[PDB]
Amino acid sequence: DAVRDPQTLEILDITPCSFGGVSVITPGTNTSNQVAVLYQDVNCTEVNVFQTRAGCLIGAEHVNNSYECDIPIGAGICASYQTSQSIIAYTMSLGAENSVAYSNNSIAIPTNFTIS
Amino acid sequence: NQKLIANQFNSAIGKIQDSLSSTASALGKLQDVVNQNAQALNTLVKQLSSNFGAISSVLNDILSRLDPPEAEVQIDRLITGRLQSLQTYVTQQLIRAAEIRASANLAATKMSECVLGQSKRVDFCGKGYHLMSFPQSAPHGVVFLHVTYVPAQEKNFTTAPAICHDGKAHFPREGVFVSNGTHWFVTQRNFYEPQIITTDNTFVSGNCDVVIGIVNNTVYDPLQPELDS
Amino acid sequence: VTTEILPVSMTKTSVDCTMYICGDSTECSNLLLQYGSFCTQLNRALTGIAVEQDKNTQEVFAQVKQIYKTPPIKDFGGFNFSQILPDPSKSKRSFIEDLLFNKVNGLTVLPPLLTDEMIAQYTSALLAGTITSGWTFGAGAALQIPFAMQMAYRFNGIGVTQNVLYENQKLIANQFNSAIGKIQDSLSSTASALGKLQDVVNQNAQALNTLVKQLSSNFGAISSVLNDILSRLDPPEAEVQIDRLITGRLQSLQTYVTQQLIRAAEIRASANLAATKMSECVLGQSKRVDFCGKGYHLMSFPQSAPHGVVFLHV
Amino acid sequence: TTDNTFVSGNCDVVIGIVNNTVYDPLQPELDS
Ligand SMILES: *[C@@H]1O[C@H](CO)[C@@H](O[C@@H]2O[C@H](CO)[C@@H](O)[C@H](O)[C@H]2NC(C)=O)[C@H](O)[C@H]1NC(C)=O
Ligand SMILES: *[C@@H]1O[C@H](CO)[C@@H](O[C@@H]2O[C@H](CO)[C@@H](O)[C@H](O)[C@H]2NC(C)=O)[C@H](O)[C@H]1NC(C)=O
Ligand SMILES: *[C@@H]1O[C@H](CO)[C@@H](O[C@@H]2O[C@H](CO)[C@@H](O)[C@H](O)[C@H]2NC(C)=O)[C@H](O)[C@H]1NC(C)=O
Ligand SMILES: *[C@@H]1O[C@H](CO)[C@@H](O[C@@H]2O[C@H](CO)[C@@H](O)[C@H](O)[C@H]2NC(C)=O)[C@H](O)[C@H]1NC(C)=O
Ligand SMILES: *[C@@H]1O[C@H](CO)[C@@H](O)[C@H](O)[C@H]1NC(C)=O
Ligand SMILES: *[C@@H]1O[C@H](CO)[C@@H](O)[C@H](O)[C@H]1NC(C)=O
Ligand SMILES: *[C@@H]1O[C@H](CO)[C@@H](O)[C@H](O)[C@H]1NC(C)=O
Ligand SMILES: *[C@@H]1O[C@H](CO)[C@@H](O)[C@H](O)[C@H]1NC(C)=O
Ligand SMILES: *[C@@H]1O[C@H](CO)[C@@H](O)[C@H](O)[C@H]1NC(C)=O
Numbered sequence: 236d237a238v239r240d241p242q243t244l245e246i247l248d249i250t251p252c253s254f255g256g257v258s259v260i261t262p263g264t265n266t267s268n269q270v271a272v273l274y275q276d277v278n279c280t281e282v283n284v285f286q287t288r289a290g291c292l293i294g295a296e297h298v299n300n301s302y303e304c305d306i307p308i309g310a311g312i313c314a315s316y317q318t319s320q321s322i323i324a325y326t327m328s329l330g331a332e333n334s335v336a337y338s339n340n341s342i343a344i345p346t347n348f349t350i351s
Numbered sequence: 352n353q354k355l356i357a358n359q360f361n362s363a364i365g366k367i368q369d370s371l372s373s374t375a376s377a378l379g380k381l382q383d384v385v386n387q388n389a390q391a392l393n394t395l396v397k398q399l400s401s402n403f404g405a406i407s408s409v410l411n412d413i414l415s416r417l418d419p420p421e422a423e424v425q426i427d428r429l430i431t432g433r434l435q436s437l438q439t440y441v442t443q444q445l446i447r448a449a450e451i452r453a454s455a456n457l458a459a460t461k462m463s464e465c466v467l468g469q470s471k472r473v474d475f476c477g478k479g480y481h482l483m484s485f486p487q488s489a490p491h492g493v494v495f496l497h498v499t500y501v502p503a504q505e506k507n508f509t510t511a512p513a514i515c516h517d518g519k520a521h522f523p524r525e526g527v528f529v530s531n532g533t534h535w536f537v538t539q540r541n542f543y544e545p546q547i548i549t550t551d552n553t554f555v556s557g558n559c560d561v562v563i564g565i566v567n568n569t570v571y572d573p574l575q576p577e578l579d580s
Numbered sequence: 581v582t583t584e585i586l587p588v589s590m591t592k593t594s595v596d597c598t599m600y601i602c603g604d605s606t607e608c609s610n611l612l613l614q615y616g617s618f619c620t621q622l623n624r625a626l627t628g629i630a631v632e633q634d635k636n637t638q639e640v641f642a643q644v645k646q647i648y649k650t651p652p653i654k655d656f657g658g659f660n661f662s663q664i665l666p667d668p669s670k671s672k673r674s675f676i677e678d679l680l681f682n683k684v685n686g687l688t689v690l691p692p693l694l695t696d697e698m699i700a701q702y703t704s705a706l707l708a709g710t711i712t713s714g715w716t717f718g719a720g721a722a723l724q725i726p727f728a729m730q731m732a733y734r735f736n737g738i739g740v741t742q743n744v745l746y747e748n749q750k751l752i753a754n755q756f757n758s759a760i761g762k763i764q765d766s767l768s769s770t771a772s773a774l775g776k777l778q779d780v781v782n783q784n785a786q787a788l789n790t791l792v793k794q795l796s797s798n799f800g801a802i803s804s805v806l807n808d809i810l811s812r813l814d815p816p817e818a819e820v821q822i823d824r825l826i827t828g829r830l831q832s833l834q835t836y837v838t839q840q841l842i843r844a845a846e847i848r849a850s851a852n853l854a855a856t857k858m859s860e861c862v863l864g865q866s867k868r869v870d871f872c873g874k875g876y877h878l879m880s881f882p883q884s885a886p887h888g889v890v891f892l893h894v
Numbered sequence: 895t896t897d898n899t900f901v902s903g904n905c906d907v908v909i910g911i912v913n914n915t916v917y918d919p920l921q922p923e924l925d926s
């Protein structure tokens with residue numbers, strides 16, 4: 236786990252040399268031949284660069300806006316092809332925000348319906 | 352709404368036809384079973400070309416090249432490799448088959464409870480309230496068409512747990528008391544259709560001093576006009 | 581209120597067979613390739629499971645189309661849900677959820693798509709719906725209804741006339757609030773309550789520890805260390821000793837993967853049951869005996885938990 | 895009878911509706 240150096244009497248921890256799987260993140264080739272490459276579980280210093288928990292993503296731009304997940308990367312991150320168009324990375328949304336108008340004397344009752 | 356319901360149903364059937372139609376992704380679940388089995392078979396056969404430490408993966412090349420004292424050793428190397436490949440294959444098939452065993456049990460359960468009757472189980476027959484379903488034949492599996500009731504437009508109503516009449520508390524036999532801001536009605540929860548609140552709709556139990564949120568209204572008795580007339 | 585705990589997912593492990601068997605060895609790799617595509621077959625088996633672990637999580641927790649917020653006014657007719665609702669001052673998890681979480685070589689571990697924060701967000705939506713819109717949000721759109729009115733339907737559904745709830749509403753709310761405090765104390769200092777989740781974690785850890793420890797075994801070889809063979813024997817002899825280690829290590833991986841596939845099959849089934857329970861116990865009321873614990877089922881609330889889901893059955 | 899059935903809608907909107915007499919147990923009582 237660690238070694239005490241023979242001359243300095245200092246202790247240094249031993250980590251493995253960075254490694255991990257290499258994944259290609261792509262839209263279907265039917266609409267785009269643009270790709271991004273994710274180096275899983277590694278630092279960007281070892282390998283439009285985004286460092287995340289799942290690894291180093293090179294090629295896609297990162298944005299502030301969340302979107303429903305399209306093609307997942309992991310650890311809260313998904314990617315998509317958006318406006319001209321390019322591959323982007325974002326924190327995934329789990330759906331649109333909503334609420335219930337919970338007044339303590341209010342009820343909603345359907346007046347029409349459909350059969351699906 | 353029989354005319355409307357029949358029209359919505361007929362439209363819904365056309366919609367599933369178009370969804371299933373040109374796009375094969377809809378049936379990916381059946382395609383995956385076929386593909387995984389094909390891959391397992393292709394892998395097993397390809398392994399026959401491997402040496403597994405032998406001088407040659409071809410049994411005939413060993414037999415025609417080496418005398419038995421050496422040929423038998425090279426053959427054992429191929430037997431061990433090929434036998435291990437079969438053992439791996441069979442184990443993999445038994446595990447995959449166990450998944451299918453479970454899926455078939457679920458599919459059979461669904462037909463019995465979704466097609467041969469109506470279950471009241473949520474998300475069992477797709478989304479919405481289950482009415483009916485129809486099975487369809489499919490390659491290596493079964494496709495279920497689920498017909499469900501889904502609420503659409505909704506309206507904002509005021510409610511109350513009970514109506515206070517003569518000091519007695521009146522509760523719905525079935526349904527909820529609602530108000531349009533001017534008048535109280537009683538209706539079924541899953542389809543707004545307001546009724547006049549009467550003694551034939553509600554029942555009396557307890558009183559106005561013990562019901563939280565009880566409101567003042569008039570409960571109609573269909574018998575009194577008859578006694579007076 | 582009773583607690584039922586089910587596992588949902590396993591650690592998304594991944595194994596590099598080259599690094600495991602022939603790490604930093606050209607001569608070993610050349611021999612490993614003589615055994616065909618066993619690595620491809622094993623790698624696909626483990627990758628497939630890692631994918632299924634997200635499928636299991638998705639089926640159990642992602643049961644809403646919208647994320648519903650709780651009301652600004654926590655007035656539910658005397659019913660106190662403050663211990664199951666998320667705490668906004670924190671990861672926005674409930675008091676009970678924090679208590680639950682606090683009690684649980686060439687190889688790597690991949691992250692889940694949905695981290696504890698995402699699971700907590702789904703859980704929040706499920707509770708906000710259950711409490712303020714009943715089961716309508718499960719079937720379709722979330723339609724508001726007063727909590728007491730919702731309970732009236734839940735009681736009627738078990739053969740108890742609606743007036744009983746109202747006559748005893750104060751008593752029922754008090755019994756409920758007490759019951760929530762009781763589960764907090766039960767889950768609290770004692771970790772045995774979550775043994776079912778702990779067992780999944782422990783079994784996976786043991787499988788991994790066994791696989792790594794096996795690298796030190798000789799399997800009939802002069803040495804378990806590949807580098808000692810390579811620097812000691814010329815190829816005519818070194819290759820034999822290497823094959824002995826390849827066979828042993830490859831068999832160990834095959835055993836490991838098979839064991840993971842079988843354990844994963846159990847989890848597959850548990851996740852299906854957990855998802856079924858949420859749909860029929862939380863997003864509606866089943867009338868199934870012993871499905872949502874003992875007694876006649878009225879309502880339930882999910883809670884986020886490490887590697888699984890915890891259901892509180894009322 | 896009126897104690898078995900309920901009234902909702904009318905005779906012009908029900909497909910397959912038939913002509914019969916619905917009995918009211920109250921009328922004989924009012925007359926007696
Ligand atoms: C609320 O419901 C009441 C009762 O049906 C409505 O009052 C009726 O309105 C119609 C149309 O003007 C009149 O012909 C009836 O005579 C009224 N009935 C009574 C008892 O007064 C009322 O208009 C509805 N209000 C809203 C906003 O829908
Ligand atoms: C329904 O109306 C009656 C009056 O006819 C209300 O009874 C009065 O309630 C007030 C308190 O708000 C008391 O101070 C009066 O003494 C009560 N009058 C009588 C004769 O008892 C009753 O509270 C109303 N109920 C609802 C739900 O509105
Ligand atoms: C809901 O229950 C919680 C306890 O589980 C209540 O929190 C306590 O509130 C009292 C004041 O009434 C404080 O003195 C305690 O220190 C609080 N306990 C904790 C752990 O914070 C909460 O007030 C209740 N809310 C409602 C509306 O009843
Ligand atoms: C029930 O009987 C009444 C007659 O008492 C029917 O009403 C007539 O229907 C015919 C068409 O078949 C019309 O041409 C007449 O003008 C209607 N008479 C009146 C007074 O409206 C009614 O259609 C019958 N309903 C059923 C289901 O048999
Ligand atoms: C070794 O010698 C160097 C000087 O050349 C000195 O700075 C260092 O502290 C010494 N280390 C030990 C363990 O004595
Ligand atoms: C795929 O390509 C075809 C043309 O070959 C095009 O008509 C179709 O719209 C494309 N699919 C998508 C999603 O763009
Ligand atoms: C990557 O390396 C830098 C140092 O160059 C370090 O500061 C950073 O925290 C590392 N990030 C990860 C994810 O290891
Ligand atoms: C998000 O917005 C902040 C400013 O509020 C900016 O500093 C940051 O770089 C933005 N991040 C991305 C990915 O655009
Ligand atoms: C329900 O909405 C449809 C349009 O989608 C309309 O044609 C139908 O008449 C409506 N039914 C009712 C009862 O409002």
Ligand SMILES: *[C@@H]1O[C@H](CO)[C@@H](O)[C@H](O)[C@H]1NC(C)=O
Pocket residue numbers: 336343507
């Ligand atoms: C019902 O009315 C209230 C205002 O009184 C509003 O805030 C709420 O959003 C409405 N409900 C729906 C479903 O629109």
Ligand SMILES: *[C@@H]1O[C@H](CO)[C@@H](O)[C@H](O)[C@H]1NC(C)=O
Pocket residue numbers: 339340563564
């Ligand atoms: C609703 O809450 C208000 C307080 O804001 C209270 O005065 C009223 O009586 C409550 N109504 C019901 C039905 O709980």
Ligand SMILES: *[C@@H]1O[C@H](CO)[C@@H](O)[C@H](O)[C@H]1NC(C)=O
Pocket residue numbers: 909910
């Ligand atoms: C049954 O079908 C006949 C046509 O053959 C039609 O005249 C009759 O009104 C239908 N009755 C019902 C209840 O649909």
